Scaffold this active site. Sequence first.
Site, PDB file in Angstrom:
ATOM      1  N   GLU A 194       0.908  -1.215   0.016  1.00 22.96           N
ATOM      2  CA  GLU A 194      -0.199   0.017   0.028  1.00 22.96           C
ATOM      3  C   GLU A 194       0.872   1.428   0.083  1.00 22.96           C
ATOM      4  OE1 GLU A 194      -3.149   0.436  -0.346  1.00 22.96           O
ATOM      5  OE2 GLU A 194      -4.017  -1.675   0.153  1.00 22.96           O
ATOM      6  N   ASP A 195       1.931   1.405  -0.975  1.00 25.25           N
ATOM      7  CA  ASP A 195       2.728   2.504  -1.355  1.00 25.25           C
ATOM      8  C   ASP A 195       3.685   2.615  -0.206  1.00 25.25           C
ATOM      9  OD1 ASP A 195       2.107   3.890  -3.628  1.00 25.25           O
ATOM     10  OD2 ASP A 195      -0.065   3.856  -2.757  1.00 25.25           O
ATOM     11  N   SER A 196       3.825   1.606   0.979  1.00 22.00           N
ATOM     12  CA  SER A 196       4.858   1.550   1.772  1.00 22.00           C
ATOM     13  C   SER A 196       6.335   1.491   0.987  1.00 22.00           C
ATOM     14  CB  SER A 196       4.673   1.174   2.955  1.00 22.00           C
ATOM     15  OG  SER A 196       3.766   1.473   3.872  1.00 22.00           O
TER      16      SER A 196
END
Lengths: 45, 61, 263, 56, 48, 147, 67, 49, 113, 57
Positions: free
Chosen positions: F1-3
Site C-alpha cells: 500500500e505504497d510503503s
Amino acid sequence: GVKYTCGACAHNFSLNKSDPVRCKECGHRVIYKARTKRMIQFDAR
Amino acid sequence: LSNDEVNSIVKMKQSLSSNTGFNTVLKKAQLQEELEEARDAHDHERVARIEAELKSIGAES
Amino acid sequence: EPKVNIINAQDDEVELMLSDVNLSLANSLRRTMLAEVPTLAIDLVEIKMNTSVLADEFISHRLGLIPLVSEDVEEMKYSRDCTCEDYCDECSVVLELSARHEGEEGTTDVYSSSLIKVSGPGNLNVGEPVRRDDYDQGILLCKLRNHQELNIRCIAKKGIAKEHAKWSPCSAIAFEYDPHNKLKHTDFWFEVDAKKEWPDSKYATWEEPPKPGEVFDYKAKPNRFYMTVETTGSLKANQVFSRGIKTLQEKLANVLFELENSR
Amino acid sequence: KYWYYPEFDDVVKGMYLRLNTGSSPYKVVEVLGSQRIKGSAYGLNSKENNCDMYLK
Amino acid sequence: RDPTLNKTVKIRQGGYKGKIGIVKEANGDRFRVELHNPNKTIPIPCSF
Amino acid sequence: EDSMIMNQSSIDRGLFRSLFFRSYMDQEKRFGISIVEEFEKPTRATTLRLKHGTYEKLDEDGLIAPGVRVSGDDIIIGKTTPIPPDTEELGQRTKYHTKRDASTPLRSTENGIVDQVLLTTNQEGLKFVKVRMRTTKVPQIGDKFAS
Amino acid sequence: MIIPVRCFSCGKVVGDKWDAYLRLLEEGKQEGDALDELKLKRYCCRRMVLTHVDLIEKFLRYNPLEK
Amino acid sequence: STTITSGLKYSLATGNWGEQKKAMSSRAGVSQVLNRYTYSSTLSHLRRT
Amino acid sequence: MNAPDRFELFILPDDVPKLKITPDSRVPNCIIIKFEREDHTLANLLREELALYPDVTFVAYKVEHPLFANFVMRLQTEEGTRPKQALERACASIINKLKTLDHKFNEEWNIKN
Amino acid sequence: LHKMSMMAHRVKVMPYSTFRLNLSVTSPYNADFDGDEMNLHVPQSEETRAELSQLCA
RNA sequence: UGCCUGGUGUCUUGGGUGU
Ligand SMILES: [Mg+2]
Ligand SMILES: [Zn+2]
Ligand SMILES: [Zn+2]
Ligand SMILES: [Zn+2]
C-alpha cells in the site's frame, strides 16, 4: 561586554548596549554575534 | 560614540583606506552608475575619463 | 567434519569455500561478520573551533565513519562496562585534529592523516586511522581557505555494527552456493530458453554440470558455500573471520550458561 | 582602539609610556603633542592596521 | 532551591558516559538532563 | 500500500540525510516619544508575566549566542516593554514591576543548535535581530519519498 | 557537497579516491576505465563516485565570515 | 512622494492589484512569495501564468 | 522523537531474564523458550542444528515483530529425552563445529600466507 | 463517507511516530500509506468506553 | 536559610497535503 563581528570586513569588536549598531572601521550596518565559549559536543552519528 | 562621530571615523579610515574588496566593488558600481548617467547626457568627454578609470580599477583575478 | 578451502587471500579480502556445514551455520557466520564483530570508531566529537563551510554535525558524521585500526580491541572494554568516572585510557582512545590554511590564496585539504592519537590503552595497537600505505593521505575530511580553521578533539569507543553502521568491519560479504541449481532452490524466469538467457555463475566451473539424463535428487542438501569477505581496513580478513567465529561461540556459550544456571 | 577619537589628542598629551629606543633599552618619553601626517600610513599592529596619527 | 538547575553537567556512568548536558528538572534523586549530542532529554539519577 | 522498506545501514552512512534551518525575527517597536522596547534579559523581579521557558541561555544583551543547543519553549530573544508603575513604590525596595515581558520563545516542537545571530538596525533606526537555528533530520518511519 | 566517506549500499570506503579519480580523468582515461583502475567493481560503489557533484568548491568561493 | 511609493509597495507586498482602500473587488494573488524550496521550484514559479 | 535507543537491540535490562522457559501442556514433553535481545542469527542456527537430531520431533521459532529484539522457540522431543538436554546438546555441538572450523581456517591461512 | 470510516480499535503502544494498521482495514477507510493521516479520539468515561467496545468495534 | 512563573491576537490572503 559581548563580542561582535562585522558582516563585510570581519572585524571583531564589542558594544556596551548604548553604541550605535555599526562596525567601527568600515561603518557596515550588519553585525553578527560571536560563537559561545561553552563546550560543544556531538555524537558522531 | 555618536552617529556623527562614527561617520567621521569611517570617512577618516576611508581616506586611510588603501584598498578593500567590498569597497572596490562599491566604487566600481558607483563608477558604472556615473558612466550611465554621463551616457544618457551625451557627454562624450566625461565618459572617456570614466571608462579609463574603470579600466584602471578593474582586471581582477 | 567441516572443511575450509581458501581460494584467494589478501590483507583486505579473502575468498574461501566452506563445505560439510549447514546453510544456517554459514549464514549465521555471514551475519555475525557483518554486524556483531567489535571494532573501534569515533563516537564523540568536541568541537573547539570550526570556521569551515561545513556544519559541525556534518563533520562529526564524517569523522564517525573514518575506520580506525582495531587489532587489539579485545583487550579494550566497553564504555558502559567501565567503572571509571568519565573516560579512562582503558575504555576510550583520544584523537585530535588541527587544520589551518596559511596565506591569502589557495585551498587546503584536510585528510584523515591529520588525526593524531593523543592517548589510549598502553601498548595496544588500536586507535590509529587506517592508511593504505605510508604515503596515502587518507579520507578527505574537509576543505579550507584563508582564515578558516578546524580544531576538534575526538574520542573513539568500542562497539558493534548493530548499534551503528560505522562499527562494521566488513563492507560487503558475497555469498553463494549451488551454481548449477541442482537443488532447484530457484525457478528461472525466461522468455524463450532459461539456459541461454541467464549468465553463468563465477563458480560454475567448480561444480560438474548436471547430466542431460540425470533425474532430480530429492535427498540432496546445500553442501558447499562460496563466500568473499571484504573489510574496510580496520581488521584484516582472517581476523574478521576468526573473530566472527569467536563471537558466535561466545553467544552460544552464554546461552548454554544461562540454561545450566536456570535450574 | 582609541587613536581615532577626537579627544585622544588631548588624552595622550602628557602621558608617560614605555618606548622602544631602537638605537634596545626601553625608556620613557613625555608626549609634547600629536600631529597627523598624511601619506605616512603605517602598519600599527597588523597589515590592515593602517594609521596616520603620530606622537610628538 | 536546587542549585544545580540550569547548569552544565557531564554523565560518568551508564549508557551515556561522557555526554555533556544541561539539567532541566530537579525534583529529587531523578534529574532530567537534555543532551547536547542528540535532540532529546533523559532522566538520570543524581549519583550519575 | 505504497510503503517502502529502507536499509538502516544506508541511513547510518548518510543516505537522504538533510539539514534544516529556521530563522526568527524581532525588532524594537516605538510607541511614543519615549516608550520604546528594549532587548534585555528580563529578571523575575522587575518584569511580570514571564514565559514559562528558561531565560538562562540569553546573553547580557538579551540575545542567545551561536553554538548553543536550544530546546522547545526556550527563550532565544529577550525583549521587554515598559509599563506605567503601580503603587508598589509604597514599600518595595526597588523590586517593583515596571516592564512587561515580550520575549520570543523557540517553537514547542522544534530544537536544534543556534547557527547564526544577526543584529542590525531597521529603516526606522531601531534595533532589529534575526536568529537562525540549525538541526539535522535523519530519515525514519513515516518520511515521504518519491521517484 | 563533498565525497561521502562510505558507499551507502555496502559500506566500502570511497572517500579517499576522489583525488585519484580526478587525476585519472585528467590524463584522458574514460570514466569506466578510471573507476576500474580504482578497483570499484560493484556498481553500487561506482554510482557513488560517478554521480557525485562537488558543491564545496562553490561554497568556498564566498569570503570567510571571520578572520 | 508617499502616494506612489506606498501604493506600489502595498500592491506588491499583499498581491491585491489596486488601491489600498479598494481591496475588495481588486484582483488578488498577482504577487506571490517566491518558492525557494529547490532550484527547479524557483524556475517553475518564475514562469507561471 | 519516538525512536528507541539502538543499544536496546543487544543490551539486556537487569530485570529482564535472558532466557525464560515455560512448558507447553497441549502436547507431551514440549517447552516454549523466550530469548531476549536475540534475532535470526542465533535462532536459525539452533533450529537447523536441532532439526537433525533423531529425538527432536518438533522445533520452530518466530520473531513476533521486527521492531522488538527477541524471538520465541518451540521445542518438543521424544518421551525419553527432556527438551532442555537436547537444547544443551545442540549448543555444545555447534560450539565444537565452530571450533574445528576455526582450527582448519587457521591452518589453511598459514599454509597460503 | 460511511459509518465504517469510524471504527474503534485496541491500543498497542509502539515506538516511532506513525499510527499502524492491519492492512485489511485499509479498504473501509479508503486509506493507503503514501502520506495519509488519520484521527484518534480517546473516550473519557466507562459508559463511553463500553459503547465503543460494544458497538463500533 | 535565600528561595520559583504558566499566559497568548484577530482578520484577510496565498501556497500546499490527503482523499
Ligand atoms: Mg494516499
Ligand atoms: Zn566592518
Ligand atoms: Zn574507563
Ligand atoms: Zn558499494
